[PDB]
Symmetry: C4
């Protein structure tokens, strides 16, 4: 039983600027989610019953990303949801699958609805059940694109790619609503997890998704510079108008419900919590700020594409003092900024 | 010889366990552990020997759940014997008794032995001392088969010296306790994760187990202590609010509290300078409900690490260090929690 | 994509005392801003529309420093502001230029008004547009002093010096109103940025400016010890009577507006700064006095009669968060105002 | 410019327990302040106008420690305070001296009043003025015990010893009222400073004093285990009945005034201390009882029956801020007062 190293999250690191011949308006955000699936922007919405149904997925895809329909619903309803996204323009769409008895039955129905990718998502992706589930899926549907998660190690990338996954999803414990690391003691701070896993995926030719723990646009730049093909978010999108759930008002402020899929409410021992986040308005305005920040970061790094970003990215580690310097400090902020908050 | 800085030492909140390949489900794992070579526990949990934590009611409840309680010694010799006696006659449950380094030490041990106590815990502020080492030797001479836990310690050298004195198990923890001020008033101690790991390593070489005593707040902390090599975890704070702990239920402004205090606090010693504090913690209802959450957390952690057994968990556990920013990410963040979780509190 | 090292900001480090044969009242604060421009004190006011117009630049220069007139104005008005400064005595003045379609005509205007230095300043100075800008300016006005920024790597120092910069300005992300590091993920903790850049500039013969993130006089000492020729500040000066903006009273205290140049309000669409209020400080002279006294104190502690000697002989140690807590006052209820400390 | 290392303060480290054969009550706390001055306990009260006059110095002496009479009075009044302590019986007394034009005058007076040790104390002890001052005092009074400070490096230990000091005082910037590190940028976290200076002093046979930054009895154990012959405290004693100043009441709480001597108030150029108020803590003997109890407890944990053995067998580990949270009480609503713990 040994200590391997210090592992870092997004707030621990910064990207060093490079020489740049490209302006933020000239960079391309295109990325391959699998070898067969290109996104126009590297963003995905979490498959949670408070984040992504057909309305969110349609909106994500029109912006050039993708939404993964959650599976806290009957098989027929999830099929319906996928079908509505597919009929709204041949937009891309995903569907969540669990390691369950009816797993193949749920897969058959979202395939019938012509889902583009299934996400075999589970608390612990580096497990025999997930490995065998991927092998059953790829044996019946060899061309069906499969994302498997969640994981946090190069060995997990290796075993899941060996099983036939086309993409793997990284993140054990970083979610805003997640208590996995506290109740089970397990996880890897997300920037080191993505860096280590994406480096392994690149050697195998399998992309990785940086899933969870993202709070600012600059976090996504770091996830992409570390080598993730795409970034998945629940918190950043669950307050948008297109997220499921009504808008609630409490003492002058408008909120939407957001909860972990492993919380008591979502399941009705838990590994998530349930709560409220601020109402953000329409997805478009959030995406515009996220993409603007990504384009700026890429301008700072001289990267015209996502791959060039990864190839020339150098991180430095900052201390808690450096974190205090990186945020605004020693000012009473009195005007809303659209891409910042405390 | 000169003073030196050895290394950085870590507490539970500093580290995370890296997930392994798993072929085991949380409900398939076994929590059986050897507290000593002759005492098996069904779950690796112990309740602390404090006068706000463990008497008969608590020890009975702990044994029923598969753990064990250590009856505290802020008690006449006779009362402690009767406390042990009630646990033994309550269905043959395991029971332990706390013993200090006192002039009547052997008279206290005699009485709990007669009450058929299964283990005695010679616990004191500084276990790595001549008084403790001579006391273990005296007990193992009069009672060669009596199981003896000695503590508290924090170094591998202390494991060896107490193992050579004849201890069957050593208890690790100088300063991690919720109510403890040792490190602040005396400047002494070792962050608990590193203390458990370095002592467990030495104990494994010698074949003596180590207990991780103090500083546990969440079920995931227990997983880290077991993964660092402890055979069992000892908790005061987590159990002091349970209905089975001593003390009445106090209500102040809509919340329910129970008293919890260090054995080295002024109040506990009136019943020197103090090395503990006195206060209140939340009432938690029945012990069974807390243990359920603890065991569930432990089983989930073993599932993530691919460990069907506690020895497999130690053999394959890998830790990473996280910063304070990583700690912020590990807890729920950027959310207004509006519903209680039964295993997470703020 | 890899991790280079840990990088430090000012609060991460402390300077070790040296043997001293000099009293703080004997040190000299002269610095070469460029080869041609000497300042009597190594302080600059930021080129921001809530910090430096002519009033601020005139006071900074009378105190021995310099102000950089911001460019959130028409070309004509910026020339008029520089001209106000030059007509108010022998006063040094600077003017901010950006990478814009009308860049050279803005430079022509400020040159005609007799500006002493232009600051070609933009979010990312290590860029082809800044490099081409410096070359174009130097090709037309070979003797005009050019500061280029902002940057944070030794490679950018070398490229901007090769382009013909006379001085480079270091700082990506540290400013009190800046969100660059949060929104784009990019920056270098400022003490390490200044140290690594100044060392490259020393080898090349080009000075560097420590711009941004400075809060106390001690911070400036650390910036200068790390090799910067001068320190540039916005927050420390924006609350002064000579900065732009009225004085606002609210619940018994006095405030002034301070905002990033990349905030929505300054720009009037993804901002890299915020907008807010800071305490009114009174006259520039009194803040400068405290700054100077603290710098002179630090040079006393390090035995430095000059700023070059301070840099040549300074050693740092890293402190933890607990060391930070010990470095500030602690375990006291402060009941009297200190003119050079506040919580 | 170069970063030498990470430097640590008391909150950054913990001492590893040793095998012990000694109970706390059996421990001996005697120490050599200098080769010719023994204290029954290794505690000194700071030479500050809010901590030690004769009332404090006499009380420190009766407890086994010693007070340094502060210098913020006339030469005549300081000798009177020294004389009053020395006529109260066989009590030890120190007196503070500065690098002043009347330095020798003030030394003459306190020497006439039979002071036992002088403390040539200044902001920056590793300076020509202090080195010359020690040399002049020792050339006139070869047997006067001289403590010189304040310093933070082994080079300063060596330079001050070669000048004739009998003890050196370590501490640049750790004091609770101190702002040296914020306003001048200079200092060394105190545990590292004591350890590095104590190691040099032991090679030379000259003791060091750990001055400032101590909050709990456990911090003093760390400073002695790090090599100091004694610990000097202002904040821990300024709330005691024997400190100067009246007991002031506000909302049912009792306070005393405490201020740095580089604060504006004490100086009545640029300040390096703050002014404020701390809790009233009653008679000094109550506080000393708790300090000595905690020290004896720590030496029990370290198997040190006496103090010389302590440094030789002291092993520190570094703790993170998470370890710091574990070291204090946590997850408890403390409802009873503890005599040796507060937050
Ligand atoms: C996103 C989160 C956190 C999550 C989402 C929904 C529910 C949960 C709950 C609260 C139910 N918690 C677990 O489910 N915890 C868990 C822990 C360890 C293991 Cl080993 C495990 O099972 C693995 O093996 C199975 C077969 O491959 C497959 O279920 C896989 O997860 C599950 C967590
Ligand atoms: C002080 C700050 C932060 C600042 C000040 C004013 C405005 C901005 C705004 C909000 C407009 N943000 C950027 O402007 N962000 C940005 C990011 C990356 C690049 Cl690559 C970039 O462009 C570089 O290339 C161009 C040609 O050299 C030149 O404009 C140069 O800055 C600009 C920031
Ligand atoms: C859980 C805690 C902290 C604790 C629990 C109850 C009481 C105490 C008190 C406040 C009384 N504090 C000590 O007791 N402090 C102490 C410190 C150093 C030594 Cl060396 C020491 O004595 C050792 O040597 C003796 C013979 O082996 C034996 O008493 C052993 O403890 C005791 C602490
Ligand atoms: C405890 C503190 C902080 C302290 C105590 C009282 C007064 C001061 C004031 C506020 C006046 N601040 C300094 O005095 N600051 C200072 C800074 C650098 C140097 Cl180099 C210096 O003077 C050195 O050179 C002289 C010749 O020996 C000698 O006086 C020595 O101190 C003094 C500080
Ligand atoms: O309750 C749960 N426990 C742990 N992780 C969860 C839970 N529910 C969702 N997640 C993960 O957390 C991510 C959202 O993280 P966020 O973007 O920080 O809010 C999802 O994409 C899932 O990977
Ligand atoms: O007063 C004391 N001072 C220091 N440690 C104590 C004191 N009383 C009990 N302990 C220890 O603290 C443990 C409880 O830690 P907790 O589970 O963090 O509350 C006990 O099992 C003892 O090992
Ligand atoms: O909005 C902006 N975003 C990022 N940096 C800015 C912005 N506006 C001004 N700056 C920089 O911040 C410095 C002021 O930093 P301060 O002294 O910490 O307030 C200026 O000199 C500029 O270098
Ligand atoms: O104002 C000052 N500036 C810096 N240090 C001071 C000042 N006044 C007193 N000191 C130091 O601080 C010590 C007191 O530290 P305290 O015990 O932390 O309050 C004194 O013994 C002096 O060494
Ligand atoms: K900033
Ligand atoms: K989390
Ligand atoms: K201080």
């Amino acid at each position: 039983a040994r200590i391997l190293k210090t592992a870092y999250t997004f707030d621990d690191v910064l990207l060093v600027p490079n020489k740049s011949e490209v302006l933020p308006n000239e960079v391309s955000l295109k990325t391959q989610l699998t070898k067969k699936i290109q996104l126009n922007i590297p963003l995905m919405s979490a498959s949670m019953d408070t984040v992504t149904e057909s309305k969110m997925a349609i909106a994500m895809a029109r912006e050039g990303g993708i939404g993964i329909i959650h599976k806290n619903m009957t098989i027929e309803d999830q099929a319906r949801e996928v079908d509505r996204v597919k009929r709204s323009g041949g937009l891309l769409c995903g569907a969540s699958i669990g390691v369950t008895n009816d797993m193949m039955e749920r897969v058959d129905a979202v395939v019938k609805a012509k889902v583009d990718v299934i996400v075999l998502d589970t608390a612990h992706g580096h497990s025999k059940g997930v490995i065998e589930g991927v092998k059953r899926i790829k044996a019946k549907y060899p061309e069906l694109q499969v994302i498997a998660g969640n994981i946090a190690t190069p060995e997990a990338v290796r075993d899941l790619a060996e099983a036939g996954a086309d993409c793997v999803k990284v993140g054990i414990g970083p979610g805003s609503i997640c208590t996995t690391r506290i109740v089970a003691g397990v996880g890897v701070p997300q920037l080191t997890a993505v860096m280590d896993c994406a480096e392994e995926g690149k050697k195998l030719g399998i992309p990785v998704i940086a899933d969870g723990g993202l709070k600012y646009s600059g976090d996504i730049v770091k996830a992409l510079a570390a080598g993730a093909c795409a970034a998945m978010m629940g918190s950043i999108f669950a307050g948008c108008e297109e997220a499921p759930g009504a808008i609630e008002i409490y003492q002058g402020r408008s909120y939407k419900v957001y909860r972990g899929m492993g919380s008591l409410g979502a399941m009705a021992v838990p590994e998530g919590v349930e709560g409220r986040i601020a109402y953000k308005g329409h997805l478009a305005d959030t995406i515009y700020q996220l993409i603007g920040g990504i384009k700026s970061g890429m301008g700072y790094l001289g990267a015209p594409t996502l791959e060039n970003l990864y190839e020339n990215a150098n991180f430095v580690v900052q201390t808690s003092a450096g974190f205090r310097e990186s945020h605004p400090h020693d000012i009473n902020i009195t005007k809303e900024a659209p891409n910042y908050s405390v």
